Amino acid sequence: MLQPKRTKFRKQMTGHNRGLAHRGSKVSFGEYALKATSRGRLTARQIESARRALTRHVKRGGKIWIRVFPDKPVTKKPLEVRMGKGKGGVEYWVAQIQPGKVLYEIEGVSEELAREAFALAAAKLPLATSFVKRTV
Amino acid sequence: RLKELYRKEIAPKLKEELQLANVMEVPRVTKITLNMGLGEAVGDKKIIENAVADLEKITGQKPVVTYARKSIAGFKIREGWPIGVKVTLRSDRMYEFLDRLLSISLPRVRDFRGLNAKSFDGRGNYSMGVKEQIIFPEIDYDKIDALRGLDITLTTTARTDDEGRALLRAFKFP
Amino acid sequence: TRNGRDSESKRLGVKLFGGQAVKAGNILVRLRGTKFHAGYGVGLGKDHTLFAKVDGVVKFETKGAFGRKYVSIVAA
Amino acid sequence: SVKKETRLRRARKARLKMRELETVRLCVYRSSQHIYAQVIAADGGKVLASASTLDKDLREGATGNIDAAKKVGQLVAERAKAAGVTQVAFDRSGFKYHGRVKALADAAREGGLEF
Amino acid sequence: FIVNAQVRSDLGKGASRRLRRNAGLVPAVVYGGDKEPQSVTLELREIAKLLENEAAFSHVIALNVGGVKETVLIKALQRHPAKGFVMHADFLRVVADHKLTAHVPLHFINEEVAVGVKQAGGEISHTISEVEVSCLPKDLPEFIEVDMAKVELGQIVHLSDLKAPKGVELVQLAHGNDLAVANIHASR
Amino acid sequence: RELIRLVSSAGTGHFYTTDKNKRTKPEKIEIKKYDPVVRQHVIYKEAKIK
RNA sequence: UCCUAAAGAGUAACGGAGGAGUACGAAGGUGCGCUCAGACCGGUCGGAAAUCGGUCGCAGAGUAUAAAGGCAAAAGCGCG
RNA sequence: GCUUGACGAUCAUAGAGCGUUGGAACCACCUGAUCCCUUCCCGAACUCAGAAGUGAAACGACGCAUCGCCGAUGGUAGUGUGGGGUCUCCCCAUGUGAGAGUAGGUCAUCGUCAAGC
């Protein structure tokens, strides 16, 4: 799916996900957008699954922007493995998202079809999202 | 020469040929290196100074034997340590410098056209060839196989392109 | 492919902060390469340790070009 | 310039050493025209007095030579005997120690002005 | 366009945060000119009905605190990132003889009759709306028209190809950064 | 780098001590340093550790 | 040596990243001399690139060695 | 008194970029190396006999505000303490409080010293 092509380090910490998305919150490239209203994580096959629901529902045209990008490595321990024998290996990638972050954007589409497209997209996402328009 | 040809001819007219205001935006010619391509078969350390034995007798001056920057593992091997040769002749040797080729010895070997038309890279062009290391006064037929090279263009020593063309020439030789 | 082996944590930093009385031998900044520079009466040791060469109080000015953070001691 | 900064690229260490150290300074000037001198005392920023080669006694015409550099060695020295130091320190100031630079200098040693 | 406003003689984090949840107000300021900035409180119910209008930002909007009235401009409104309501409206004044930079929205009128839409199959690509201008206040436009009745499949209309009220300086043409305003592109 | 020794040319060994690459320069050193005892500087010869 | 480490020190883990078990008689002192790299280009053997000649340069270079922190009053080279 | 020198206070509100100039004093060249020497070969380096020449280049002050650079107010994020909640997070009281962004200054402000007008 969506990875960085390289990374400086193979592992990050766990970290936290605090604050609001004061950046990433405006519809910067399209006319309509799926903005998240709750915080969470998107495991890069939630990214692609909602992307495939969008492009398939429009069926004629329009340009679609993917504003989110999974950049941090997430590491699991396998089974039959005791705690603490070094940090486990990377499995997937995750974008840390805040309330207010624009996830997807679209143009060239009617306002009734964009709501029907981002409702297909939001059902494949573990977030509480919303539909927004371009403001100014 | 720095004489009747230089002092009383090249000086006073060049101000109003270009509609210039005052005196010393006349250019001057100072420097070009040998840059004899030492970097081939350079790990010798006995016949780089064959180009010292080449450069001494005909140009009258001791070379610097110039070490480069790199360990350039693609162009050559850096074990052949000094790959530059450079000399500055004098303004009091500009007499015989103007008078050693393009006065007596312009046929280095031959040119089938010396047209001063096919290079408008705006840095004061000319068209003449001097690259053989054999064409120079006071040389025998063969006591050294001293085959080397010598690379002559010129650039600007002034503001624009037009400043050099009547200045590079002194006589009516193409 | 194996991690461990951190070092033993050299205790660097600004000792004897910027209003304090000094005596004329005091180590004034332990330092890993002159993050602070030498003002009026301070010394600049070999490992870039700043040391008071006279008595007084330490000032911590910012001065000059290059944005040097200086440590100078004023005999006050 | 290519000339004025490359000597102030060389005039760098003693510039700022004698303000750290607070001792005497001899801010001279040489050129193809002239050879000057002017002295600053033991604090980095105090002018003593001035003495040019535009001084009243030797504007005779061969001004600023190595002949006319030894005339300057006892010249600002009398102007620094109202100052009160025996030794005096040497601004190289990007002026390479081969010509009028030392001939103002070494004529001060006989001229009551020690180094 | 008229806004009612009040005095707002108490400032801070927890004060401004309790106007929004108890009183239902928004904080604001007017500051512009060579004059004194003034803190202003204002109602969220009426500032959202002004932002309903298509020409909210590129239009002279009247405002009164009491009997005092000003030719006011909306300069850099602030917004809740999550729920999208207005907090801190942040107005300007108008001194009627300087250049008064603002944002002006775009129209893109002739999109049905386009040689890259009709004959050759292509769709439009809005890259930029709401260009930021600098214009004297009587020549403060609501709109800037963008004509796309001759753009072909592959042709790019820039801001160099743009237009009207002629007394309106575009800020991006003042520098070498010429911006691409729309496209017609082949479909996916 | 193997350890050397710098002796005086008398019946006195003050013996400042250091090391060098003898795998580069197989001869000795005749560079001369300060002496506390004899108080003249002297030809500081080979180690000769045996 | 950096991170974790919470803007003074310090601070754990079979936590995340790398290194050392030396070099140097000059690679030190000093005296003296002296300042990068980059794109831009000139093809008869190198033509992405050298020899370097000179034009816009805007530490991005270099530091014996890991990383951090530092530098021009150089904290790189030449030579006595 | 101003022109300009000569090291310094202050350090990109002082910085770069686009015209006019100064010749007398200063300043760069220039004429050349004889007598000092400078050369990894050289008097453009630099050492100088100099003052035959020259004010454009060279630099210098002196022009002009696009750009860098400073930058409110107000808000916001954070946060010490005390208390809540639906507690991987926020809210309330209270104290504090950015960063980024938002009209625009400006071809800076100083200090001693001197030859000349």
Domain count, chain A: 1
What residues contact residue D17 under an 8 Å CB cut-off, 6+ apart? Answer: none
Long-range contacts of B104-113 (CB under 8 A, 24+ apart): B104/B137, B105/B135, B105/B136, B105/B137, B106/B173, B107/B135, B108/B132, B108/B135, B109/B135
Nearest CA in chain E to A97: E82
**Token pair belonging to C62:** 């910012």
Nearest CA in chain A to E131: A136
C-alpha E141/C-alpha E104 separation (Å) is: 7
Q: Please name which of D107, D104, D111 lies closest in space to residue D52, comparing C-alpha atoms.
A: D104
Decide: A73 and A93 in contact? Cβ < 8 Å.
yes
Nearest CA in chain A to E111: A108
What residues of E are in the A interface, CB distance below 8 Å?
Answer: 56-57, 79-84, 103, 105, 123-127, 129-130, 185, 187-188
For residue C21, give its domain range.
13-74
Q: What is the DSSP letter of B8?
A: T
Q: Which nucleotide is nearest to B68 (CA to C1')?
A: G51
Give percent helix, percent strand, percent coil of chain B, each to the nearest 5: 15, 5, 80
- Does C4 fall in a domain? no
C-alpha D26/C-alpha D39 separation (Å) is: 4
Please tell me if residue A60 touches chain E, with a CB cutoff of 8 Å.
yes
Please tell me if residue A128 touches chain E, with a CB cutoff of 8 Å.
no
Decide: F1 and F35 in contact? Cβ < 8 Å.
no
Q: What is the DSSP string of B40-95?
A: TT-TTSSSSTHHHHHHHHHH--PPEEEE-S---TTTS-TTS-EEEEE----SSSHH
> Which residues of chain A have a CB within 8 Å of the CB of E56?
136
Does chain A reach chain E with at least 3 CB pairs under 8 Å?
yes
The CA distances from residue A75 to A46, A69, B60, D72, E10, in Å, are: 17, 18, 75, 81, 50
C-alpha A93/C-alpha C20 separation (Å) is: 52
User: Subunits that touch chain A (at least 3 Cβ pairs < 8 angstroms)?
Assistant: E
The residue type found at F14 is: H
Domain count, chain C: 1
For residue A83, give its domain range.
20-135
Q: Name all domains of chain E by residue range, CATH numbers in brackets.
A: 1-94 (no CATH), 95-188 (2.170.120.20)
- Does A2 fall in a domain? no
The residue type found at B48 is: I
Helix (H) or strand (E) holding B168: helix B165-168
Pairing state between β A89-97 and E180-185: unpaired
C-alpha E109/C-alpha E148 separation (Å) is: 7
- Does C39 fall in a domain? yes
- Does the beta-carbon distance from A132 to E84 stay under 8 Å? yes
Pairing state between β E180-185 and E156-158: antiparallel
The C62-63 sheet, strands edge to edge:
C37-38, C68-71, C62-63
> Which residues of chain A have a CB within 8 Å of the CB of E187?
60-61
Q: Please name which of E7, E89, E2 lies closest in space to residue E40, comparing C-alpha atoms.
A: E7
C-alpha B171/C-alpha B9 separation (Å) is: 11
| E strands present in chain A | 32-36, 40-42, 64-66, 72-76, 89-97, 102-106, 129-133
> Which residues of chain A have a CB within 8 Å of the CB of E83?
37
Closest Cβ opposite residue A20 in set E81, E129, E187:
E81
Domain CATH code at residue C31: 2.40.50.100
Decide: B169 and B137 in contact? Cβ < 8 Å.
no
- Does the beta-carbon distance from E188 to A61 stay under 8 Å? yes
- Does the beta-carbon distance from A100 to E125 stay under 8 Å? no
Decide: A133 and A27 in contact? Cβ < 8 Å.
yes
Q: Name all domains of chain F by residue range, CATH numbers in brackets.
A: 1-50 (2.20.28.120)
- Does C57 fall in a domain? yes
C-alpha A92/C-alpha A59 separation (Å) is: 30
Size of interface A-E (CB pairs under 8 A): 39
Domain CATH code at residue A119: 3.90.1170.10
Resolution (A): 2.9
Q: Please name which of D30, E9, A20 lies closest in space to residue D11, comparing C-alpha atoms.
A: D30
Beta bridge partner(s), residue E135: E168
Q: Please name which of E174, E53, E150, E48 lies closest in space to residue E105, comparing C-alpha atoms.
A: E53
Angle among Cα F6, F10, F11 to the nearest 5 degrees reads 100
C-alpha F41/C-alpha F10 separation (Å) is: 11
What residues contact residue C26 under an 8 Å CB cut-off, 6+ apart? Answer: C15, C16, C51, C52
- Does C64 fall in a domain? yes
Please tell me if residue A18 touches chain E, with a CB cutoff of 8 Å.
no
Closest Cβ opposite residue E129 in set A98, A108, A134:
A134
Closest Cβ opposite residue E81 in set A55, A61, A100:
A100
- Does the beta-carbon distance from A62 to E105 stay under 8 Å? no
Beta bridge partner(s), residue C27: C51
Decide: C42 and C50 in contact? Cβ < 8 Å.
yes
Give percent helix, percent strand, percent coil of chain D, each to the nearest 5: 30, 10, 60
Pairing state between β C37-38 and C68-71: parallel
